[PDB]
Curated annotation (Swiss-Prot), chains A, B:
One of its GO terms (cellular component) is T=13 icosahedral viral capsid. N-glycosylated. The N-terminus is blocked possibly by pyroglutamic acid. Keywords: Calcium, Capsid protein, Disulfide bond, Glycoprotein, Host endoplasmic reticulum, Host-virus interaction, Metal-binding, Outer capsid protein, Signal, T=13 icosahedral capsid protein, Virion. GO terms for molecular function: metal ion binding. The keyword Acetylation does not apply. Some rotavirus strains are neuraminidase-sensitive and require sialic acid to attach to the cell surface. Some rotavirus strains are integrin-dependent. Some rotavirus strains depend on ganglioside for their entry into the host cell. Hsp70 also seems to be involved in the entry of some strains. In group A rotaviruses, VP7 defines the G serotype. Residues 110-112 are annotated as: CNP motif. Belongs to the rotavirus VP7 family. Calcium-binding protein that interacts with rotavirus cell receptors once the initial attachment by VP4 has been achieved. Rotavirus attachment and entry into the host cell probably involves multiple sequential contacts between the outer capsid proteins VP4 and VP7, and the cell receptors. Following entry into the host cell, low intracellular or intravesicular Ca(2+) concentration probably causes the calcium-stabilized VP7 trimers to dissociate from the virion. This step is probably necessary for the membrane-disrupting entry step and the release of VP4, which is locked onto the virion by VP7. Residues 182-184 are annotated as: LVD motif. This is Outer capsid glycoprotein VP7.
UniProtKB/Swiss-Prot annotation, chains C, D:
Intermediate capsid protein that self assembles to form an icosahedral capsid with a T=13 symmetry, which consists of 230 trimers of VP6, with channels at each of its five-fold vertices. This capsid constitutes the middle concentric layer of the viral mature particle. The innermost VP2 capsid and the intermediate VP6 capsid remain intact following cell entry to protect the dsRNA from degradation and to prevent unfavorable antiviral responses in the host cell during all the replication cycle of the virus. Its main location: virion. GO terms for cellular component: T=13 icosahedral viral capsid; viral envelope; viral intermediate capsid. Zn(2+) binds at residue 153. It comes from the Viruses. It comes from Rotavirus A (strain RVA/Monkey/United States/RRV/1975/G3P5B[3]). Residues 62-73 are annotated as: Interaction with the inner capsid protein VP2. The VP6 trimer contains a zinc ion located at the center of the molecule. The zinc ion is not essential for either trimerization or transcription activity of the DLP. Zinc-depleted VP6 has an increased sensitivity to proteases. This is Intermediate capsid protein VP6.
Amino acid sequence: NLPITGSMDTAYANSTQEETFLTSTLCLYYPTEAATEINDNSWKDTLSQLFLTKGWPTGSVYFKEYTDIASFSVDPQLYCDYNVVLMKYDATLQLDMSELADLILNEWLCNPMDITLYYYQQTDEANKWISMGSSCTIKVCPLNTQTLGIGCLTTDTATFEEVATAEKLVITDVVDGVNHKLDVTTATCTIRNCKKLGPRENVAVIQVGGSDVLDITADPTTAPQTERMMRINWKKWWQVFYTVVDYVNQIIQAMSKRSRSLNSAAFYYRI
Amino acid sequence: NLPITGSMDTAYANSTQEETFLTSTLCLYYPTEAATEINDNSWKDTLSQLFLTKGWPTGSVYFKEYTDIASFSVDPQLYCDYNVVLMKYDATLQLDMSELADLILNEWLCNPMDITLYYYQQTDEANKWISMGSSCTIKVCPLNTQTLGIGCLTTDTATFEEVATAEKLVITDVVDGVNHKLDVTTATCTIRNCKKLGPRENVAVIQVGGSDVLDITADPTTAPQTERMMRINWKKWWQVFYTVVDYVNQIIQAMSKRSRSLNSAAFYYRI
Amino acid sequence: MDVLYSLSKTLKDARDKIVEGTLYSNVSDLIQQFNQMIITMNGNEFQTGGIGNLPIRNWNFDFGLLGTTLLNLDANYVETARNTIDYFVDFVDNVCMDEMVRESQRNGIAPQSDSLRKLSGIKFKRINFDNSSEYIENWNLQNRRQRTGFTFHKPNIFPYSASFTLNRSQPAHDNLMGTMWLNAGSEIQVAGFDYSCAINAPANIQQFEHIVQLRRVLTTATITLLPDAERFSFPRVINSADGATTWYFNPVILRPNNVEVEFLLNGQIINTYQARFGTIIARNFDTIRLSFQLMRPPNMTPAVAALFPNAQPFEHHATVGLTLRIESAVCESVLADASKTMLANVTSVRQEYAIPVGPVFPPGMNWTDLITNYSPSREDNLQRVFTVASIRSMLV
Amino acid sequence: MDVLYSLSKTLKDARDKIVEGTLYSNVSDLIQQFNQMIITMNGNEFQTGGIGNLPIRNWNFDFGLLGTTLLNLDANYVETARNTIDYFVDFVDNVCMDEMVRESQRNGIAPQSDSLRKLSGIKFKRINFDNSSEYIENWNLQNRRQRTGFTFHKPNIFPYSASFTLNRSQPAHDNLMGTMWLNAGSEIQVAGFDYSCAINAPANIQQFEHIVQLRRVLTTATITLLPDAERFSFPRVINSADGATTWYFNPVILRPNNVEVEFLLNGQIINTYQARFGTIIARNFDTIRLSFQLMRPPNMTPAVAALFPNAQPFEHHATVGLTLRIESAVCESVLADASKTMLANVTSVRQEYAIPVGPVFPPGMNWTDLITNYSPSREDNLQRVFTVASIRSMLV
Ligand SMILES: *[C@@H]1O[C@H](CO)[C@@H](O)[C@H](O)[C@H]1NC(C)=O
Ligand SMILES: *[C@@H]1O[C@H](CO)[C@@H](O)[C@H](O)[C@H]1NC(C)=O
Ligand SMILES: [Ca+2]
Ligand SMILES: [Ca+2]
Ligand SMILES: [Ca+2]
Ligand SMILES: [Ca+2]
Ligand SMILES: [Ca+2]
Ligand SMILES: [Ca+2]
Ligand SMILES: [Ca+2]
Ligand SMILES: [Ca+2]
Ligand SMILES: [Zn+2]
Ligand SMILES: [Zn+2]
Ligand SMILES: [Zn+2]
């Protein structure tokens, strides 16, 4: 990172939309019920040809399927340069979907949390505990300077306070500056101490149906809808995919290249 | 592609090896027999830890396994920024080793061929026909200027001249300027008309045991033996992997980034 | 130059003072000077023009002297004087125009037109009399190698530059820290912006700096410093430094903190004002250093607290601005300013006669290019042409 | 300057001609000039300044005239003359040194030291006599705005620059096409290299171009042009343009083909030479355009064909050179050259007395920096100091 000096009289360059469409890849994540309703084995080819009409080279649009929001929330691996997640809306899962967005619309720096030997705390409002697995049931016992527990006994987990049960993904936020003993099913869950660095610009979430319920910020005073959080009413999935294809330029305009240099181990679908 | 003007007094920068390892990744391709002899369920983990001692961050080194040279030759996909292929030497598979090395050490620009409709010819010395699949059998019938076979009958394919039998990968080089009718088992193998653009500088091949027998150029008058074609003597595979880990600095020094802009969206690892 | 100025001054005084009914006592010395000018110029042939579309004109001087025995001037005397005055004024105007359109690199201070070079001969020094105008006075001081001084109201010392620097940037341009400025003429507006409102800053303070180098030393400068930059206080879409994309700026203005304006000469702090606004005096300087701070308000009302959240997205971007206007200054070099017209006169003469671009000045006499690269040769030529323009303005 | 030169010339002539036993007829005019100098200088106080570590020195002149009335000069005459000449020579050397260490951005052709400014008064013009040296002759021509000419053996016209241009390149730096050059003093060595040896070129020909834009116009220049550039004909490891890495150069030298040396003035072809080597004459130019070609040999013996395969790797890289030496030339401006000592003298005087860096010349009188930015102000100051240096070298 170096200072960048620019002249306000500089001329705008031509549109780079065609070049980025040519040199980038698009990943679409949709629920399995979409494929079920569409009921066509060649719909991937059809959408690829339509995207080609929109400018994307054949083979650069990758279609990925997930069973549901809860299943997809277990270590979501976003591959392409541009990722669009068609997330079905369920009034009962408002938190979970929000968490999923909170997981994929932001960059997270995470380190392992070996709870069974160590005591942990959250240093600042950017710190959270992200737990992912088949079943994440997390109980918390706040502690104090004398190392005793408040309304909890370290020797009896039954007295721990319940913050998660049977979760595929959950973001736990506790009071900062306080040590907590943790009890999570390590067999079916992995908990990580994470810091949200900032927005993840290459991931857009399109909520299919419902209303604006997403809250990607733990602060109760903010519920910001960024340009990467779209929301479309629906009755047929074919119309949903047609509107995704037709307004692909608008969707990618709302997104930007990831720009982060990572330390992780994930594959990517790039050109 | 613009001219670059440089001064012969510009100060050398510091070593980029540390940041290169922290920002790049290493795919190591080994045969199945290597894992069989190692006889450990966690040799990947210890090799990754040793690589970390050598500088690479955890999860950056990828370990891919192939049954043998023939099977690996069937459309090999190279994922990491730096690819090292440990190829065992067999005195009876020199041409197959050479063809694999040619395919993965050079950059190729390929287009499909329709052998059942049109006749084909090779324009210049860089033009070849690469056929790969489960079983490639290619027979050729050179035609004269009256589109009539020479020493072959266009109607009868039994008179055709056999250039490949049951191969999994074969690079066919015929006389340039002559139209050839091709009889290829398209049901089990695909043939593509390709041009050699240049070297793939991100792929190194380490020949385990044997002699210098590789020939990555069809010209009889050249056997280059470039700096990306190493050879070692061995008795045990653990020694081979320890040598690869210890001298990974030299291996990566012998390689450079791919530098080619691709029109194809494939699966890669990139940190 | 002094002889040309003296011709112009004699002609102007003749126009002003040789009027019907005036006592000869009021013009006796002027009439003597005028007759001396006639005597000196008589029998001399001059040629002006021949550059661009400026026409070649030949000038011959064979004139009679003015009478000296009148008690009061009458109509006949005034018309007799006016014929000669008209011819001489035309000659002086053409000589000035011929000199204004020419330039030289090595010796641009010296006369370039053949007419003015001929007028620089010794015999013409008899024409020379009172050199009282500011520009001719500075010309004579320069020729004597004395300290020169030009007073400028709103000196045009800053070349036009609307620019920005991003000290913190991302490809999406949503968390931007930096500063944007306009330098134009005698005016400097600067504005440091933080999109996060310095929430993650060490002491919740973001330090902004702006250094402006003046191409010439300014002395005895009166400046007005104001705590807001109205130019960068409204929302705007701004090109990226490479022009590849455009980013959004949505200012919300907070008062600048620890404002410190330093006026430096050769890297030495001459003047320093902290938290001082209104009229200040910079006595001698060539560089201006404006250092200010964005301090996050420790206490916020619910609306203000709503403006600035803990983390992104940042929709309202904190901005602190400074305005610095040089109202008057003194410079040892010639500059275009708001009150004078020499630059306008030279540019007008060069444009009207389609003077080809020379090796000294930028095409079209563009001031931004001239002041950006204000070399000593350009200063010589500019002083020469500005002095000639001032001489011409006495008559035309 | 002409008075200072005349003092130095009179003193040098006195030292060379006032010798024991010489006929007075050999020195009569010299004795008259010397006595005129003594009369003009008597009663005048001079001070050579204290710039840097140059000591403040005071000079008083009260000398008797050199005698007449001798048929042959004797020892007494020569001894008296030697005393006077020694004092005068010390004064002249100190004045020259004081002038050599000073500079002004504007009016840098004018005298800078107080002693030389005093000597520029009318009362010392009597000292002025024969101005025959090349530098004083050109000084007088410049003062009159006449054509100036300085003859240089091996003129130092090219600032040092060892650079390269990669027209075809890639991160591995194994298949490179481009040019590398050294421009230093009066010499240009250029070399166009192709790693593929023009295997894939349109006609197995690779075109190489090198344009060197001289910062002053050279006239009547004799230039040796040789085919090979020995400086770029051996294996090298060269930094990358940005310094990130190093690439390898393994030249094999082929003769340049279709050599084309153009000497251009103001973008107009003045001289052209095709397939010409040895001495060539460029009569008037400010730019040199060298066009050469690497032609792949149509026929190659097995050893040659082994070096140039159809495809990569390319281990022997085909290079075509060109050497261009300006043996002598004429320039209207002053330049450092191989035969003269003016630059060395000025630099030595500045370094010996620890003269602080001024606003005109680069620190240390660095010639590369000087001629890279050879501005009119720099040209005036440099001509002044070089003329003073030559005047001093007449005596010191
Ligand atoms: C940009 O678009 C214009 C408008 O057609 C075209 O002329 C130009 O070549 C394009 N490219 C650039 C680099 O300006
Ligand atoms: C490079 O290395 C040198 C010495 O090893 C060190 O002083 C310097 O800080 C390093 N980094 C850079 C950017 O030069
Ligand atoms: Ca959940
Ligand atoms: Ca409890
Ligand atoms: Ca917390
Ligand atoms: Ca919230
Ligand atoms: Ca084979
Ligand atoms: Ca046959
Ligand atoms: Ca062939
Ligand atoms: Ca070969
Ligand atoms: Zn930007
Ligand atoms: Zn010599
Ligand atoms: Zn390079």
